[PDB]
Design a protein around this ligand. Sequence first.
Ligand SMILES: [Mg+2]
Length: 130
Amino acid sequence: GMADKELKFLVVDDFSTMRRIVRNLLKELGFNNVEEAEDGVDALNKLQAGGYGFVISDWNMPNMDGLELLKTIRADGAMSALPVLMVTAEAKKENIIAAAQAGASGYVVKPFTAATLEEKLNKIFEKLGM
Ligand SMILES: [Mg+2]
């Protein structure tokens, strides 16, 4: 819920309904510049076009999962610093630690509300100095 309301989000989830949920919560908070991807490879293909400012990624996706997507983002020169918020159905100490070591900006359990998403985005913005 930072003031840069045109920050371009990539919402990554293999469930169309989950992408629509995140897309609608972001809209409620004032973020309308949003694109969607269905797995890690889809997401990287769209990220290569440039201009993205925030990634919200499902942890469990086929072909390329959220952890491998995050690792590929952090290894990319031009995207190295992109915020990545990981989304999971269940919080597990080991998943959270592995995500943190791979550079995850944050971690949220679904289903979540607009207030909770707003809280996660702010905390990430504040942590990174945005
Ligand atoms: Mg999934």
